[PDB]
Design a protein around this ligand. Sequence first.
Ligand SMILES: C[C@H]1C=CN(CC2C=Nc3ccccc32)CC1
Lengths: 244, 178
Amino acid sequence: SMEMDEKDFAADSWSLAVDSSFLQQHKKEVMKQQDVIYELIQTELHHVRTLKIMTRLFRTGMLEELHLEPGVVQGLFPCVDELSDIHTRFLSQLLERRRQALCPGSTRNFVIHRLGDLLISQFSGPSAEQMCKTYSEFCSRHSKALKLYKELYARDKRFQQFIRKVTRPAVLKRHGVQECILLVTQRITKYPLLISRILQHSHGIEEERQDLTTALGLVKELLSNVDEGIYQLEKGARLQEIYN
Amino acid sequence: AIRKKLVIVGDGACGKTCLLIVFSKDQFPEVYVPTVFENYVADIEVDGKQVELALWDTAGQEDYDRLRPLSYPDTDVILMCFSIDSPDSLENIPEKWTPEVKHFCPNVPIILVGNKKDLRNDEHTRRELAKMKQEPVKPEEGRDMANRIGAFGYMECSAKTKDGVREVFEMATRAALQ
Ligand SMILES: C[C@H]1C=CN(CC2C=Nc3ccccc32)CC1
């Protein structure tokens, strides 16, 4: 991620991110809502950072430094380009909404009043259909990717030296090839936990409460559709095994 | 520094995310208690052995039966959570979670963790439960369940007051090493 956005999301909460003289000007309920909204953008920035590691560091690193088929690299990181474009666009609209909410003469003090319209747009229409289709594919190829990684690491010396080398810096501690795959898979289920806690503290403006109410139903409908279209793929699974 | 994977399972209101946050931060979050837990690699040295313990959560996955098992591959220790102020969460342990964990993680040790032990001696908590013909989970009830389900251990902790949290994860590291 870029240095501008890391510093903007370095603090543990919105009440720590904003200037203490600006925090003092607000109600308790507003700070509570803003802490939960900040968590959504902070965890989305980290999710996008994870996907940029899988594509720029893992995927492209293997393509430009190792001698394995492009079908092997594809088996390791399925739909990473499709996911990275989906989440970078979602992050882009979240960060822009925050920037437009900043006070004149400030780069830290902001208050996001309208979020539901942004989440309704993301979790409905063609953007929702592209997430349903991409996550159903990713999560089906999830176990196949882990076995391919385990096979490769235990049988290729150059792949082992590549992995040990790129995952050596302390900042990559939580981001292995397998932790990245699980981090992506678990992300979709984090949205109804965050949207329900924002909705819990958004009862002041009735329009915001109903928009978040709708956005939460859109996420649950999307999650139900992703889950209903999952069927684990196995490398070298016979046709007889699949119809049994 | 051998790498081991720990996964925490349980009902939504059992307090599993809180436990994982309090351990990783090592401090009760003074200003904001986070909604979600992504992952964490804990540096733990139990009994002279250095182990990196990856900490995972199934929170949010409880209703998604074909999404939840994608957290189970390569698990070394399972922490089976239940709330002490919710006796119905303990009842769900042998008939919902236990068949599922033993199917996807065969031969992986399970530690029965009763969270929120502070609420066992809480006024409002005992008062609410009495209004449904109930009381908080007693120590012998948790131990009996841990035995009945074939758990490696039964432990109790309070994520709020921090009592017993360090030892759950040092014992988990030990179970993962067997
Ligand atoms: C241990 C402290 C942790 C949370 N505090 C309340 C708080 C501050 N920000 C928010 C946002 C949403 C919900 C609750 C809060 C009080 C106690």
